[PDB]
Design a protein around this ligand. Structure first.
Ligand SMILES: CC(C)CCC[C@@H](C)[C@H]1CC[C@H]2[C@@H]3CC=C4C[C@@H](O)CC[C@]4(C)[C@H]3CC[C@]12C
Ligand SMILES: CC[C@@H](CO)NC(=O)[C@@H]1C=C2c3cccc4c3c(cn4C)C[C@H]2N(C)C1
Ligand SMILES: CCCCCCCC/C=C\CCCCCCCC(=O)OC[C@H](O)CO
Ligand SMILES: CCCCCCCC/C=C\CCCCCCCC(=O)O
Length: 388
């Protein structure tokens, strides 16, 4: 039917405006936004340490996406029918695509776990070797999920060697489009949900112990004040010392120093109590209050509010990262799991959602680092080409 053949002639139209849109809105902000973070970690000597190395690994992964994956994925937009590049590049590009796309997700998952354990066990920290182990393991996972695509390969015809037409066929790669999405997306998703609620419980548990310490400390002061006996000053001071140390152990090693001072005073106080002079010791315990006010009280709200806000913004940005991948993977999963649905339009939907996921992974590290003043005014000097 010529009235339909002409319609397919219109279907294979010109789609340069969409390609220009993707260059302007996604690829350029990806390469630039990631090179900014890499420059920030590389140049700023004050930014160099354990966590930023992992963050830089993530930025490298996303930069590699925006450098090798997306420009070829464009050529597929324009040259819709047949794969233009050589035959080897179809498994090469697909492998790189899955590899990096998985690497970003698992990077975020590992960062979530780290940010949680840092709240749980703050005193147990995080060398360079730890970060190296983490980078290696994450990239090993990404390779392990990505390797079936180059191992299996794209079907070829002895008749038509040229017409490869790169696509993950449902018939050929069905199990991979299922279990690869399960191992690559939904598993770290569930992990991050678990660590989310665990982080809520961890923060709410840390906040209570600080209050108990506070009025543990405050109560015993009242005990020292009304102490007619000598022994109790030793007991009250001992328990105040324990409470002070316990409260100080909630933060990695400046109101925190006020605990050291406090303990010191307490020691001297229970020296007088050990000498017998209770009336002279209670007089110094009556001025433990100055240290208790100038440092401890301001320390309590600072820790809580800081960890609260940081975990909050981290949760939000990570949630918005994972939200923009959902269409791709729910479409990819159902595409396997539906013999009733139309496969053609279901493939077009993937061909659109890939760019939502692409822009989600591309701008993620920059967005995450922009909530840090040091990174911000490093970027400001970089976009003004000032450097150092
Ligand atoms: C050809 C299409 C894909 C667009 C071209 C992309 C490249 C060449 C462009 C797009 C955005 C550009 C980057 C934008 C931001 C910076 C920060 C600056 O401190 C160094 C240059 C650098 C890193 C630019 C280098 C060139 C750049 C990466
Ligand atoms: C729409 C054009 C088609 C052509 O077949 N391209 C794809 O389907 C690519 C395949 C992907 C994939 C498949 C299976 C598991 C996966 C992934 C990814 C990560 N994980 C864990 C990345 C995702 N890529 C971005 C797109
Ligand atoms: C209804 C339950 C569904 C979603 C709840 C979880 C929504 C948020 C999921 C991502 C949150 C996250 O990843 O948090 C990491 C945590 O902050 C690291 O310490
Ligand atoms: C360590 C890396 C862990 C490996 C995770 C890999 C599992 C992804 C699922 C692999 C399933 C292959 C599907 C076979 C096929 O249909 O071609």
């Amino acid at each position: 039917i010529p009235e339909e053949m002409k319609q397919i002639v219109e279907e294979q139209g010109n789609k340069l405006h969409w390609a220009a849109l993707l260059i302007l809105m996604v690829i350029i902000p990806t390469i630039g936004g990631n090179t900014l973070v890499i420059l920030a970690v590389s140049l700023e000597k004050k930014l160099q340490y354990a966590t930023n190395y992992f963050l830089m690994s993530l930025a490298v992964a996303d930069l590699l996406v925006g450098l090798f994956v997306m420009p070829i994925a464009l050529l597929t937009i324009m040259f819709e029918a047949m794969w233009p590049l050589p035959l080897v590049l179809c498994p090469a590009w697909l492998f790189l695509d899955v590899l990096f796309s998985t690497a970003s997700i698992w990077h975020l998952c590992a960062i979530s776990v780290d940010r949680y354990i840092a709240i749980k066990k703050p005193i147990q920290a995080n060398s360079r070797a730890t970060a190296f182990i983490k980078i290696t393991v994450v990239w090993l996972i990404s390779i392990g999920i990505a390797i079936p695509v180059p191992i299996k390969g794209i079907e070829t015809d002895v008749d038509n060697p040229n017409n490869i037409t790169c696509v993950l066929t449902k018939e050929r790669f069905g199990d991979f489009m299922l279990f690869g999405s399960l191992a690559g997306f939904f598993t770290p998703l569930a992990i991050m949900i678990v660590t989310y609620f665990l982080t809520i419980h961890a923060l709410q548990k840390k906040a209570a112990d600080l209050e108990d310490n506070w009025e543990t400390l405050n109560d015993n002061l009242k005990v020292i004040e009304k102490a007619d006996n000598a022994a109790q000053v030793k007991d009250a001071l001992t328990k105040m010392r324990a409470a002070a140390l316990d409260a100080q152990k909630a933060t990695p090693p400046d109101f925190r120093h006020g605990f050291d001072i406090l303990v010191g005073q307490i020691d001297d106080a229970l020296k007088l109590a050990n000498e017998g002079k209770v009336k002279e010791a209670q007089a110094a315990a009556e001025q433990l209050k100055t240290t208790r006010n100038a440092y401890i009280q301001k320390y309590l709200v600072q820790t809580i509010s800081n960890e609260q806000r940081a975990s909050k913004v981290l949760g939000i940005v990570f949630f918005l990262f994972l939200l923009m991948w959902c269409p791709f993977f729910i479409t990819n999963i159902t595409l396997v799991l539906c013999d009733s649905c139309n496969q053609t339009t279901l493939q077009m939907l993937l061909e659109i959602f890939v760019w939502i996921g692409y822009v989600s992974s591309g701008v993620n590290p920059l967005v995450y680092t922009l909530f840090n003043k040091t990174f911000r005014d490093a970027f400001g000097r970089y976009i003004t080409c000032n450097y150092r």
